[PDB]
């Protein structure tokens, strides 16, 4: 069956600009192509059907466009709410196949993350083991590093780290970073540092609890 | 509105079956092509089979995946469309949606259920609070959060407390670590309150509990 093809994934443009993603198709659709919107939760929008009409409701600064093989889709003037996935799908030939899909994120001023690092909580401990939880909440850019060192050591074992999707009010993104460990191994230490290394500094930006403090 | 709203999701072990219903409601359901969708966590957009309208009959297309495996039926007295899914696979977990128009200019696309195939046995979440430590830190907005740890399938939601003062609740996507799942969700809110009011997080996961946990200390 045909398929789709979505080169690039992700796309970062600042809102004012005129933003193109193309989809290409292995054979010749005739046309038969729509292009979808999907947030980060569920919903899934159509925004264009046969190349270039606009569903009711879609903003004119969305245009779509192409034949034979080759298409686009264009946002004139990228506005915040277009943060998305974009995706293309072929209905000229059964079955319907979409597009891998085009992630666009909003470029934004650097932001400087806000480090926040808790100990175990009395109930955890009480049963067995200890995690040390790290928010490093609400930077730009996305790419940034943490590491963990306990009493000095970096740790490998026991890391859990995710991401938000972009802000869709102000277009950072947070992360949390988890090390677990057992009650015992956790007794025996003392200090607990979480290292993060982002665009926004030289040094790496640390907090740390020394579990002897408190 | 014109409503539809996917409702069969949960988890079925590999080699059973379950039934999915798409509930609409504000146009004339008959009217239109009602198709089945799901995306695959990854994975691109899959059509899985559509059924036409009255005027055509209502007859079926469905994609060679699926054909013989999964049927799509429609009540058109309730206005409920329906997909029965049969020797379910692994592979066959994703996110499913149903959709009015698939050709264009009338579609709407419900949000999804999810279902889980899979051979592990439910497993509700071990939820803990986090505080600062005690001397150590603070300055004006206090971040707490909580962890809800070793719960299985997904999804869980965190509720707070809603006044808009703060409150930048963040909710960090469950990830999956030694065959269980672990969410984090964290508040942060104005000094004036925590420590002087209280704030709970409330953890709901449908397959059966809500524990609610307070910030102390």
């Known amino acids: 069956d045909i398929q789709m093809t979505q080169t690039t994934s992700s796309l970062s443009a600042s809102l004012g600009d005129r933003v193109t993603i193309s989809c290409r198709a292995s054979?010749?659709?005739?046309?038969?192509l729509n292009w979808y919107q999907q947030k980060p939760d569920g919903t899934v929008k159509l925004l264009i059907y046969?190349?270039?009409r606009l569903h009711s409701g879609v903003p004119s600064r969305f245009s779509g466009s192409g034949s034979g093989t080759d298409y686009s889709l264009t946002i004139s003037n990228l506005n915040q709410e277009d943060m998305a996935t974009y995706i293309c799908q072929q209905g000229n030939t059964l079955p319907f196949t979409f597009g891998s899909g085009t992630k666009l994120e909003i470029k934004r001023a650097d932001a400087a993350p806000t480090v926040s690092i808790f100990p175990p909580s009395s109930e955890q401990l009480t049963s067995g083991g200890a995690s040390v939880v790290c928010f490093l909440n609400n930077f730009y850019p996305k790419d940034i590093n943490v590491k963990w060192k306990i009493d000095g050591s970096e740790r490998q074992n026991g890391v859990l780290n995710s991401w938000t999707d972009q802000d869709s009010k102000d277009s950072t993104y947070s992360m949390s970073s988890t090390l677990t460990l057992t009650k015992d191994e956790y007794e025996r230490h003392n200090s607990y540092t979480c290292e993060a290394t982002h665009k926004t500094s030289t040094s790496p930006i640390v907090k740390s609890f020394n579990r002897n403090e408190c | 509105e014109v409503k539809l709203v996917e409702s069969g999701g949960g988890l079925v072990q590999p080699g059973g079956s379950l039934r999915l219903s798409c509930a609409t409601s504000?146009?004339?359901?008959?009217?239109?092509?009602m198709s089945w969708v799901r995306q695959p966590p990854g994975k691109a957009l899959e059509w899985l089979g559509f059924?036409?309208?009255?005027?055509?009959?209502?007859?079926?297309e469905y994609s060679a995946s699926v054909k013989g495996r999964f049927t799509i039926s429609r009540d058109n007295s309730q206005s409920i469309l329906y997909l029965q899914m049969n020797t379910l696979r692994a592979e066959d977990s994703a996110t499913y949606y149903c959709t009015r128009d698939p050709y264009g200019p009338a579609a709407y696309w419900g949000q999804g259920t999810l279902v889980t195939v899979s051979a592990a046995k439910t497993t509700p979440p071990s939820v803990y609070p986090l505080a600062p430590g005690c001397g150590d830190t603070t300055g004006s907005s206090v971040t707490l959060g909580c962890l809800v740890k070793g719960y299985f399938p997904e999804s869980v939601t965190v509720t707070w407390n809603s006044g808009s003062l703060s409150s930048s609740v963040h909710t960090f996507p469950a990830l999956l670590q030694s065959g269980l799942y672990t969410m984090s969700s964290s508040v942060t809110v104005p000094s004036s309150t925590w420590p002087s009011q209280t704030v709970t997080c409330s953890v709901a996961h449908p397959a059966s509990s809500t524990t609610v946990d307070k910030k102390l200390e």
């Open positions: 046969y190349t270039s």
């Open positions: 504000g146009f004339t359901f008959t009217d239109y092509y």
């Open positions: 059924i036409r309208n009255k005027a055509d009959g209502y007859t079926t």
């Open positions: 054979q010749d659709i005739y046309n038969y």
